[PDB]
Design an enzyme around this catalytic site. Structure first.
Site, PDB file in Angstrom:
ATOM      1  N   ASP A 168     100.235 -45.469  -4.965  1.00  0.00           N
ATOM      2  CA  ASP A 168     100.616 -44.532  -3.832  1.00  0.00           C
ATOM      3  C   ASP A 168     101.806 -44.746  -3.411  1.00  0.00           C
ATOM      4  OD1 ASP A 168      99.281 -41.844  -2.907  1.00  0.00           O
ATOM      5  OD2 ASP A 168      99.710 -42.935  -0.945  1.00  0.00           O
TER       6      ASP A 168
ATOM      7  N   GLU B 148     103.674 -43.658  -8.047  1.00  0.00           N
ATOM      8  CA  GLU B 148     103.934 -42.338  -7.654  1.00  0.00           C
ATOM      9  C   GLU B 148     105.445 -42.158  -6.952  1.00  0.00           C
ATOM     10  OE1 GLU B 148     102.337 -40.735  -3.929  1.00  0.00           O
ATOM     11  OE2 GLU B 148     101.949 -38.824  -4.667  1.00  0.00           O
TER      12      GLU B 148
HETATM   13 CL   LIG Z   1      99.848 -38.896  -9.584  1.00  0.00          CL
END
Ligand SMILES: [Cl-]
Ligand SMILES: [Ca+2]
Length: 447
Positions: free
Chosen positions: A174, A200
């Site tokens: 993330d 990401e």
């Molecule tokens: Cl994603």
């Protein structure tokens, strides 16, 4: 051959476990991305999973024993688990976590103030010109970890490694754009083996930090795919997609994770091009294109009806509510189970032995058709009039099931839905109604 994964957004562990056995496994979905399993702040909003308190496996999804039960059951079913991993920050402010731990003013059960970067706010103008601030300041007040610290890296690597010992096979990193790639590179040196890792990075262009910087540490999410597919199905011409991928300025196919929408961009709404479950048949078509087109590692999205509330968490009722499936209505939408999407996945699985786009044909506007060599062919009609063109395919003559509408029978003499005929010259006389499509492959051929 497994080729697609799915994001079971806010699905508890018992539901994911059951889904793996009776649906994902049998159908051929490769993996499931689960919501963050570590201890996080309290509250019913979905975004609370993105505010970590500790690395203990006690979350809204369940406890450590239930998480391990899910990884055991999914694996036996042939489905891998990818854990959404928070490598950039911890919760903001002070409060309580789901396991009982309290935190406050950059003081956590596993980190002290010195483990974070000195406080500063990331302003919208920093994304464009100040890389230092995008990576060292706080994303919306979230305590920014000092990811260059050997201690912070060992603490995150230990969490990743405990998960792999349990059986987890992949990880979503993330908010990677907010962590220097060099830091992600040191962390990876501390991770055992080579699990699937996708990072990401939201890079639409003109950003001070580019997605290409993350290519050597793993897969990267290509948000240009999602953004451009939507503008094309909504305002453009499908004929434009003949060379979707590298020619549109996207990163290498083998390094990309693609999707029509994710949990974040499906919330924004109104003015914005992303296509989501709320678009009905438009959503089917975008997915059929994505799953048929040979580019990236796609993930199907599985959402819940949030009813206009962009902060709300998922439904109160479980997906598998005692032999009663709570899908397709006002609770869980279950897109990975939609006829066209599942059928698209079946198409991608059976055409994996030919990653080329052959015999591309379009009407210069919104009717397209292309093949995957002799493994399969497809066509989409995003116009208000029947598609009756004659297209050339590289397939063997015979009759095939349109896998978007039904499947081949046990005896192999029929299909449960529409049948498509491939002539002796290898052509197909299309007869596709408005806003509909077809997909056929070599392993769904009659008698
Ligand atoms: Cl994603
Ligand atoms: Ca950071």
């Amino acid at each position: 051959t497994p080729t697609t994964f799915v994001h079971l957004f806010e699905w508890n562990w018992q539901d994911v476990a059951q889904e793996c056995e009776q649906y994902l496994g049998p159908k051929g979905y490769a993996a499931v991305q689960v919501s963050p399993p570590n201890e996080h702040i309290t509250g019913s909003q979905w975004w609370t999973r993105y505010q970590p308190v500790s690395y203990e496996l006690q979350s809204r999804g369940g406890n450590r024993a239930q998480f391990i039960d899910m990884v055991n059951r999914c694996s036996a079913a042939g489905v891998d688990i990818y854990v959404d991993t928070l490598i950039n920050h911890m919760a903001a402010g002070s409060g309580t976590g789901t396991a009982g731990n309290s935190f406050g003013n950059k003081s956590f059960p596993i980190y002290s103030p010195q483990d974070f970067h000195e406080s500063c706010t990331i302003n919208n103008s920093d994304y464009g010109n100040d890389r230092y601030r995008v990576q060292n300041c706080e994303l919306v007040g979230l305590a920014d970890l000092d990811t260059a610290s050997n201690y912070v890296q060992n603490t995150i690597a230990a969490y990743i490694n405990d998960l792999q010992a349990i059986g987890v096979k992949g990880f979503r990193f993330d908010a990677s754009k907010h962590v220097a790639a060099s830091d992600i590179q040191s962390l990876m040196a501390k991770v055992n083996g080579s699990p699937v890792v996708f990072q990401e990075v939201i890079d639409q262009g003109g950003e001070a930090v580019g997605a290409s910087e993350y290519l050597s540490t793993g897969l990267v999410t290509e948000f240009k795919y999602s953004t451009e597919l939507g503008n094309t199905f909504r305002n453009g011409s499908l004929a434009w997609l003949s060379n979707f991928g590298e020619g549109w300025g996207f990163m290498p196919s083998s390094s990309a994770v693609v999707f029509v929408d994710n949990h974040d961009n499906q919330r924004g709404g109104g003015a914005g091009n992303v296509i989501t479950f709320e678009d009905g048949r438009l959503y089917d078509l975008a997915n059929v294109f994505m799953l048929a087109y040979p580019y990236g590692y796609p993930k199907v999205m599985s959402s819940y009806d949030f009813h206009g509330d962009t902060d709300a968490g998922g439904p109160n009722v479980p997906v598998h509510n005692n032999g009663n499936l709570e899908c397709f209505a006002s609770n869980w939408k279950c897109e990975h189970r939609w006829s066209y999407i599942a059928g698209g996945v079946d198409f991608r699985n059976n055409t994996a032995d030919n990653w080329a786009v052959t015999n591309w044909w379009d009407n210069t506007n919104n009717q397209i058709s292309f093949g995957r060599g002799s493994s399969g062919h497809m066509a989409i009609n995003k116009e208000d009039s029947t598609l009756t063109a004659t297209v050339q395919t590289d397939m063997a003559s015979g009759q095939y099931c349109n896998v978007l509408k039904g499947e081949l029978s046990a005896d192999a003499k029929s299909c449960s839905g529409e049948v498509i005929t491939v002539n002796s010259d290898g052509t197909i006389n299309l007869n596709i109604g408005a806003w509909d499509a077809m997909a056929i492959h070599k392993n769904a051929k009659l008698n």
